[PDB]
């Protein structure tokens, strides 16, 4: 990295105001229908959101005991933004190491803990449940059949992207990116704090982003300097943040932090979701870093809209029968 992160954290220049500060009770389906979930949102308190979180003093070791000591986790090397892998016990050892003894800065942003004990300790905002394509569009008998708690693709029965635990040490930095498939993101600061820089997905900015990706100079060019308006904003302990489809963001961690969050597609900004998918295609993003079963899901969305509106099914007889059995439960 050749830019100075500390000047990016200190400057007053990222002074756009893109974020809407909301109350949880107002974050409902009617709000989504009216606004298209186009605006990033901050909930300074959880009242009215319908979230559930672990004990306030939950630790990384607690996460490890819920997911398993031997669970392989993807870890980011902050200096290179490259991925490595280790077990959750090894990750916990790292995390518990005093700061002045850690040889390198590593970050975990990708531990998906669905189908472990941890899963029932964390609930996302109720309203996300009413609109996530996984919950509302994917054949339910397939989702319910998932047993594997890792993100091994051969065992994956639906897009396993709903619930992640992020564990970040002071000094961590995740460089600018758009979440896979143009997914929207919810993000809850259980403990600690985060700094985000937000860049809106205008056609121009998305062109810049793609060209930056294709240049390979991500360590040299701080993308928030290349655009007309960027917002840097701090999330404090207990805040919930929702990031809309397409939004280009980077994140810095000023104190050891534990976050619960996750990703979702939805029906109100499909064009952006498709745009982002096509950027991933052109920039040759490896499958492993993409939304699993993306076009499969899109076919299921079409079928659900036609069925729900017209009562005509385009699922197989067997699939219809599986669905009817569940309707009778």
């Amino acid at each position: 990295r050749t830019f100075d992160l500390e000047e990016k954290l200190q400057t007053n220049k990222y002074n756009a105001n893109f974020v809407t500060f909301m109350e949880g009770k107002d974050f409902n389906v009617e709000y989504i229908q009216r606004g298209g979930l186009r605006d990033p949102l901050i909930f300074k308190n959880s009242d009215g959101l319908g979230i559930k979180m672990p004990d306030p003093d939950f630790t990384v070791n607690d996460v490890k005991m819920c997911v398993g000591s031997r669970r392989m986790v993807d870890v980011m090397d902050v200096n290179t933004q490259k991925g490595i892998e280790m077990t959750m016990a090894q990750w916990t050892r790292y995390y518990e190491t005093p700061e002045e003894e850690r040889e390198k800065l590593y970050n975990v942003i990708s531990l998906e803990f669905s189908h472990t004990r941890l899963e029932n300790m964390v609930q996302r905002p109720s309203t996300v449940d009413f609109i996530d394509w996984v919950d509302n569009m994917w054949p339910r008998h397939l989702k319910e059949s998932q047993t594997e708690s890792t993100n091994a693709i051969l065992e994956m029965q639906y897009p396993k992207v709903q619930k992640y635990c992020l564990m970040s040490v002071r000094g961590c930095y995740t460089d600018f990116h758009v979440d896979f498939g143009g997914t929207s993101v919810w993000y809850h600061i259980h403990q600690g704090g985060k700094v985000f820089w937000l860049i809106p997905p205008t056609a121009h900015n998305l062109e810049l982003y793609e060209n930056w990706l294709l240049s390979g100079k991500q360590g040299d060019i701080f993308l928030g300097d290349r655009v007309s308006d960027c917002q840097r904003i701090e999330l404090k302990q207990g805040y919930t943040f929702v990031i809309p489809s397409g939004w280009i963001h980077a994140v810095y961690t000023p104190t050891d932090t534990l976050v619960f969050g996750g990703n979702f597609l939805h029906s109100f900004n499909i064009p952006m979701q498709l745009k982002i998918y096509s950027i991933e295609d052109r920039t040759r993003v490896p499958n492993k870093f993409r939304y699993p079963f993306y076009y499969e899901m899109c076919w299921y969305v079409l079928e659900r809209y036609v069925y729900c509106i017209t009562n005509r099914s385009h699922l197989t007889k067997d699939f219809q029968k599986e669905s009817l059995s569940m309707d009778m439960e």
């Binding site: 990295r1 993807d74 980011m76 290179t80 933004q81 490259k82 991925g83 942003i109 990708s110 998906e112 890792t150 993100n151 091994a152 693709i153 051969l154 065992e155 994956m156 897009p159 396993k160 992207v161 992640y164 995740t174 460089d175 600018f176 990116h177 979440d179 896979f180 990706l213 390979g216 991500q218 360590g219 990703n263 920039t283 993003v285 499958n287 492993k288 870093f289 993409r290 939304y291 699993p292």
Partner: peptide, 13 residues
């Protein structure tokens, strides 16, 4: 060595 999907990570430098 099983292949994974839905790994969150920006691009490498």
């Amino acid at each position: 060595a099983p292949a994974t999907g839905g790994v969150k990570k920006p691009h490498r430098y």
